[PDB]
Design an enzyme around this catalytic site. Structure first.
Site, PDB file in Angstrom:
ATOM      1  CG  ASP A 138      -5.938  -5.543   1.828  1.00 37.95           C
ATOM      2  OD1 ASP A 138      -6.395  -4.749   1.123  1.00 37.95           O
ATOM      3  OD2 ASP A 138      -5.686  -5.360   2.936  1.00 37.95           O
ATOM      4  CB  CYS A 156      -5.986 -25.888   7.319  1.00 35.81           C
ATOM      5  SG  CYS A 156      -6.146 -25.750   9.079  1.00 35.81           S
ATOM      6  CB  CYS A 211     -11.075 -26.691   7.588  1.00 37.42           C
ATOM      7  SG  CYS A 211      -9.713 -25.777   7.434  1.00 37.42           S
ATOM      8  CG  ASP A 224      -2.319   1.087   1.041  1.00 39.84           C
ATOM      9  OD1 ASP A 224      -3.247   0.915   1.914  1.00 39.84           O
ATOM     10  OD2 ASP A 224      -2.251   1.665  -0.289  1.00 39.84           O
ATOM     11  CG  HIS A 242      -8.562 -22.491  11.030  1.00 41.13           C
ATOM     12  ND1 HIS A 242      -9.098 -23.533  10.256  1.00 41.13           N
ATOM     13  CD2 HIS A 242      -9.581 -21.857  11.176  1.00 41.13           C
ATOM     14  CE1 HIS A 242     -10.468 -23.392   9.870  1.00 41.13           C
ATOM     15  NE2 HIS A 242     -10.775 -22.177  10.668  1.00 41.13           N
ATOM     16  CB  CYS A 282      -8.933 -28.584  10.461  1.00 37.93           C
ATOM     17  SG  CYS A 282      -9.324 -26.901  10.717  1.00 37.93           S
TER      18      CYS A 282
HETATM   19  C1  AFQ Z   1     -10.792  -2.048   6.109  1.00 38.55           C
HETATM   20  N1  AFQ Z   1     -10.908  -0.981   5.293  1.00 38.55           N
HETATM   21  C2  AFQ Z   1     -10.171  -0.161   4.582  1.00 38.55           C
HETATM   22  N2  AFQ Z   1      -8.819  -0.350   4.084  1.00 38.55           N
HETATM   23  C3  AFQ Z   1      -8.338   0.324   3.579  1.00 38.55           C
HETATM   24  C4  AFQ Z   1      -7.282   0.596   2.480  1.00 38.55           C
HETATM   25  C5  AFQ Z   1      -5.988  -0.099   3.232  1.00 38.55           C
HETATM   26  C6  AFQ Z   1      -5.843  -1.727   2.398  1.00 38.55           C
HETATM   27  N3  AFQ Z   1      -5.078  -2.596   3.344  1.00 38.55           N
HETATM   28  C7  AFQ Z   1      -3.309  -2.207   3.269  1.00 38.55           C
HETATM   29  C8  AFQ Z   1      -3.099  -3.134   4.531  1.00 38.55           C
HETATM   30  C9  AFQ Z   1      -3.410  -2.383   5.919  1.00 38.55           C
HETATM   31  C10 AFQ Z   1      -2.116  -2.896   6.634  1.00 38.55           C
HETATM   32  C11 AFQ Z   1      -0.992  -2.903   5.757  1.00 38.55           C
HETATM   33  C12 AFQ Z   1      -1.360  -2.771   4.337  1.00 38.55           C
HETATM   34  C13 AFQ Z   1      -7.069   1.825   1.717  1.00 38.55           C
HETATM   35  N4  AFQ Z   1      -5.883   2.079   1.307  1.00 38.55           N
HETATM   36  C14 AFQ Z   1      -5.709   3.175   0.446  1.00 38.55           C
HETATM   37  N5  AFQ Z   1      -4.514   3.292  -0.081  1.00 38.55           N
HETATM   38  N6  AFQ Z   1      -6.792   4.016  -0.167  1.00 38.55           N
HETATM   39  C15 AFQ Z   1      -8.153   3.435   0.379  1.00 38.55           C
HETATM   40  O1  AFQ Z   1      -9.183   4.112   0.171  1.00 38.55           O
HETATM   41  C16 AFQ Z   1      -8.336   2.443   1.425  1.00 38.55           C
HETATM   42  C17 AFQ Z   1      -9.531   2.286   2.084  1.00 38.55           C
HETATM   43  C18 AFQ Z   1      -9.481   1.061   2.941  1.00 38.55           C
HETATM   44  N7  AFQ Z   1     -10.431   0.667   3.593  1.00 38.55           N
HETATM   45 ZN    ZN Z   2      -8.669 -25.663   9.595  1.00 35.24          ZN
END
Ligand code: AFQ
Ligand code: ZN
Ligand code: AFQ
Ligand code: ZN
Lengths: 359, 359
Positions: A256, A296, A294, A92, A325, A299
């Site tokens: 993710d 894995c 599952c 990100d 898991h 399990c």
């Molecule tokens: C749970 N919701 C959510 N997450 C968003 C994230 C993060 C996605 N996950 C990255 C990981 C977090 C830990 C390290 C990498 C968002 N990121 C960006 N750049 N812009 C969003 O609108 C954006 C919007 C998001 N909404």
């Molecule tokens: Zn499992």
């Protein structure tokens, strides 16, 4: 392999299944990407993450730029070598997690489109996210529009920074992020601006920030068709099993979330009959595995009663087993989704999944 | 396999190498036994503990009788099944770790010779320790003598409790524990009392409780010859690499310690050039493995710099990797000791080890 090639092998409604080919490997879509933080998927060796079926993982830019430092990681050979994961990594851009002093140049807390792209280069990221402004929820239309417009200016800056670096441009891919909160016209302006610039894939940003599933789905309904059909569609930060299924029904290819790793360490186990909290006293003498079907390793070998004991005791093996898991469960979900689209029976799968998961 | 057979295959001075055959497996001696607590070797799956070379592990009676309960573990199929370790398990008797209300019957805090033996039966222990009174250090001779004498009365009670239970007597082994603090005459009385009762193996108790290596070695010098030569000699709670080497030089066959697991999680890594603390800033960009010669999976795949990062960050993978390396190091030490006795070059090995470890 090519730097980047997305091919759609089968479709069902708005759902797609296919593959992204990259130099470090192939990514089966729809894909779930386990999240690291600090150059590790918490409580798992990389070989365990791979054994669950993951094709790609997310790296945590924000943390790494602070510790150990992006330049240090590059000195040490890059993130893949550092952590022992040799397959693709998406990073990100670092601004969602930063979100102190915000301006058109970027943010101090320092990070700008150019510096974000350079940090991701130093880490050796395979899929680089453009640097954006995530918009809080709820947002007034004025505020949403301003934010979106800034993000699109930063998207062009990100594109030009990435292209400026030959090594990066030749070996990595760049995704743009659609903003606009819940407003259809702003989502359209955003899609159009990103398409004009041109990216290897398109994320839907700004969701999963408190709007709830019904509203998330309503915005996806109009937002995903706005993106180029022939490139992957990434829903950032989503989510629960049921969120993933409905988002694939609306055209999302990549996901993710920290839910499986974080909540695993907290006692929450995913099962085809819904989540369970293994700390509950009802599991103290339950010899069944976390989930009945599952595949894995957890399990196959350990009972609910043992894992209940471990988590109650705060033992590290408890976090290890719960996380393996949960990530395996998510990968099995993605596999069932892929196979069901490929066989033209995904809508049936989605209905069956929901009936049982919420039974 | 037999219930219990100890065979000495080679000797050098007071050092011995051989094997203990039991129903659940063979134990190579001299042996290092990783310690669990709460039905896990902290931060390792059982298959990882086995891959390091461990032939037997210690179970933690005190913790388990409190959580989850000995009767619950028996209901669930016993400790081996519960935790997924199918090879031998030694259990301590629970009193060292208890050490509230002490009397001739036992202790409340409840535990007596009979109840300790029954708890170890419920756990399904392969090697059962007699229930003893550990003697604090320093101890006056009067106090040492009283304690030793009680322990020997409790040793007979333990023997009779074990023999009373046919299932236990037929499938498990029972070790007695020599007390007497640092006093040779009390150590002799103790040895004689235990030999009269008769056990499958003999532990040296009451050491590693603050006396220091020189004093520990002085007491071993006279104490180990007092025990029956043809049965295994177990030094409880020892210890550092250099302690293990000198104790084998004095006739000890078996060892347990939390040092490699606990200190691993704290940043201390064992190496053939002495311990290192991986948190030290000097390792932040060190691409070498924890130890230059070590054959473990950790040293094959990850750098000092990565493990330094993980432990500084408090990441669970850090504890996992440090503990796997440390237990592997200990097992490699035991293997070098076994092979060197078998080849009649252990005294040379001990000298070489020390020169480099303390270089
Ligand atoms: C749970 N919701 C959510 N997450 C968003 C994230 C993060 C996605 N996950 C990255 C990981 C977090 C830990 C390290 C990498 C968002 N990121 C960006 N750049 N812009 C969003 O609108 C954006 C919007 C998001 N909404
Ligand atoms: Zn499992
Ligand atoms: C470190 N020194 C030391 N430990 C001793 C121990 C414990 C050995 N390790 C058992 C593990 C600890 C966690 C669960 C099992 C001793 N135990 C007994 N019964 N009697 C001793 O004199 C005795 C003496 C000991 N001295
Ligand atoms: Zn090693």
């Amino acid at each position: 392999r090519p730097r980047f090639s997305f091919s759609i092998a089968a479709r069902e409604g708005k759902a797609r299944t296919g593959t992204i080919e990259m130099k470090r490997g192939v990514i089966r879509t729809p894909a779930f990407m386990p999240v690291g933080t600090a150059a590790t998927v918490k409580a798992l060796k990389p070989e365990t993450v791979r054994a669950t079926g993951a094709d790609i993982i997310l790296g945590n830019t924000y943390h790494l730029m602070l510790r150990p430092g992006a330049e240090r990681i590059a000195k040490l050979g890059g993130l893949h070598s550092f952590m022992g994961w040799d397959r693709p990594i998406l990073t990100d851009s670092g601004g969602y997690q930063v979100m102190t002093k915000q301006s058109e140049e970027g943010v101090t807390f320092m990070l700008s489109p150019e510096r974000s792209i350079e940090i991701q280069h130093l880490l050796g990221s395979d899929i680089v996210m453009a640097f954006d402004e995530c918009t809080p929820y709820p947002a007034t239309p004025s505020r949403a529009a301003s934010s979106m417009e800034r993000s699109m200016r930063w998207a062009k800056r990100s594109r030009d920074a990435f292209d400026s670096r030959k090594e990066q441009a030749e070996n990595a891919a760049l995704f743009g992020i659609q903003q606009g909160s819940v407003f259809e016209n702003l989502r359209q302006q955003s899609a159009d601006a990103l398409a004009e610039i041109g990216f290897d894939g398109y994320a839907v940003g700004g969701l999963a920030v408190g709007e709830g599933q019904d509203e998330m789905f309503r915005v996806l309904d109009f937002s995903v068709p706005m993106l180029p059909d022939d490139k992957p569609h990434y829903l950032m930060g989503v989510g629960k099993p049921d969120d993933i299924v409905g988002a694939v029904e609306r055209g999302i290819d990549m996901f993710d979330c920290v839910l499986p790793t974080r909540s695993g360490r907290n006692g929450q186990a995913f099962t085809w009959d819904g989540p369970i909290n293994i700390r509950n006293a009802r599991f103290s003498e339950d010899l069944k595995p976390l989930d009945s079907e599952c595949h894995c390793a957890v399990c196959q070998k350990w009972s609910r009663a043992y894992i209940h004991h471990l988590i109650r005791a705060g033992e590290i093996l408890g976090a290890m087993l719960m996380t393996e898991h949960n990530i395996a469960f998510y990968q099995q979900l993605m596999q069932k989704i892929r196979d069901s689209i490929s066989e033209g029976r995904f809508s049936q799968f989605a209905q069956d999944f929901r009936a049982r998961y919420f039974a």
